[PDB]
Amino acid sequence: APPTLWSRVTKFGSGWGFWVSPTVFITTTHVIPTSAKEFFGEPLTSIAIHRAGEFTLFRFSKKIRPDLTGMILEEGCPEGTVCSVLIKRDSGELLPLAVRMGAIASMRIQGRLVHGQSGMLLTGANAKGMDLGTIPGDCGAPYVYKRANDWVVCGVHAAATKSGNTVVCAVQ
Amino acid sequence: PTLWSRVTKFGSGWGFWVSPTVFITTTHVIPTSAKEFFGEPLTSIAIHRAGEFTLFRFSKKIRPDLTGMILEEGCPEGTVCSVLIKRDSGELLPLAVRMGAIASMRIQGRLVHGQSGMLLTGANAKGMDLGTIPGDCGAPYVYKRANDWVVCGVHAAATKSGNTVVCAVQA
Ligand SMILES: O=C(O)Cc1coc2ccccc12
Numbered sequence: 001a002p003p004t005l006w007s008r009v010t011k012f013g014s015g016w017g018f019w020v021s022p023t024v025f026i027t028t029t030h031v032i033p034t035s036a037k038e039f040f041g042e043p044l045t046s047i048a049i050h051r052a053g054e055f056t057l058f059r060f061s062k063k064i065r066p067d068l069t070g071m072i073l074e075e076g077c078p079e080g081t082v083c084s085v086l087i088k089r090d091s092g093e094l095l096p097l098a099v100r101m102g103a104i105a106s107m108r109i110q111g112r113l114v115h116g117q118s119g120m121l122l123t124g125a126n127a128k129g130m131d132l133g134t135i136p137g138d139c140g141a142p143y144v145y146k147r148a149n150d151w152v153v154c155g156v157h158a159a160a161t162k163s164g165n166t167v168v169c170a171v172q
Numbered sequence: 173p174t175l176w177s178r179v180t181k182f183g184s185g186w187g188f189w190v191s192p193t194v195f196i197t198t199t200h201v202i203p204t205s206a207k208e209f210f211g212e213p214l215t216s217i218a219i220h221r222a223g224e225f226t227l228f229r230f231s232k233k234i235r236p237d238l239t240g241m242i243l244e245e246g247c248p249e250g251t252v253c254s255v256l257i258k259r260d261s262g263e264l265l266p267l268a269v270r271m272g273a274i275a276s277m278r279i280q281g282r283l284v285h286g287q288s289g290m291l292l293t294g295a296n297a298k299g300m301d302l303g304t305i306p307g308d309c310g311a312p313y314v315y316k317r318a319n320d321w322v323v324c325g326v327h328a329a330a331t332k333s334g335n336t337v338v339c340a341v342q343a
């Protein structure tokens with residue numbers, strides 16, 4: 001995946017977030033530190049926060065990442081789209097995990113109720129574990145795909161089933 | 173400890189540490205001019221070649237941090253393997269492959285013997301991280317069976333289209 005996509009993936013709370021543009025940062029709601037009143041040196045009063053279940057978007061009133069171009073954010077993707085989940089792991093290793101996307105779903109995972117776009121890993125069989133699959137520290141990582149000449153971001157990593165085969169992308 | 177730490181840059185491709193003393197690779201990526209590998213003189217290295225599969229056995233522990241893994245001669249038809257691809261970007265690309273018959277295949281002009289496979293990452297990579305490239309040769313084929321990782325060969329060849337691959341196997 002392009003270097004300019006990996007540069008937008010930022011360590012955040014108990015996981016990750018993704019810069020869509022100089023002013024717009026998206027993440028998974030449950031990774032946000034709950035008592036927090038300041039982000040990138042800005043008070044809450046100078047930030048527009050839009051929450052929909054496990055999807056959260058931060059819009060800043062100043063340019064936090066002026067090195068970046070604004071890119072396209074969509075509400076999930078067509079069934080059958082192959083996405084990459086942009087996962088960073090201990091030591092500058094980069095894991096763009098291939099996933100085939102399916103329907104919008106409501107599921108129960110480890111007791112909690114989860115809603116988003118379902119998908120199935122294309123990395124191997126029985127993908128439980130860090131080598132072929134996702135771990136809790138991956139939450140907030142972006143789902144991206146190449147559409148003709150450009151790249152699209154279509155959600156953030158929210159959950160994976162016990163077996164590891166099914167994942168859920170939280171969507172705008 | 174990770175499977176990924178066993179995948180090592182080697183010659184014009186990659187190889188894989190099965191144990192502290194055993195390294196497997198694709199025959200065509202091995203340097204043809206060398207006096208040593210991994211600091212051990214070639215004098216002290218056992219080399220077992222069967223077509224595009226090569227195994228090295230060292231006389232001392234090169235990777236003492238590792239346990240020995242199960243190495244088999246390919247896998248049952250229908251097994252979904254992962255090919256553990258490393259790229260010089262620092263990207264790690266595990267790709268699902270459905271394994272088929274042992275065969276001699278015509279792959280971009282040349283005859284290659286090994287276990288055929290089909291990538292399961294769909295129509296086209298299309299500049300997405302979904303297929304193999306020539307620099308990936310020697311990457312291992314692995315699958316989980318009960319509680320154990322099994323390694324069953326090395327990446328030898330792939331078609332232009334991308335979808336057919338060949339896994340070179342022991343013996
Ligand atoms: O490139 C990086 O990963 C580090 C970085 C440098 O200033 C930043 C501001 C916001 C988000 C991330 C960064």
Ligand SMILES: O=C(O)Cc1coc2ccccc12
Binds near residue numbers: 249250251252270292
């Ligand atoms: O080969 C197997 O036993 C399982 C399998 C993996 O990808 C498939 C695609 C279609 C039909 C079957 C399969």
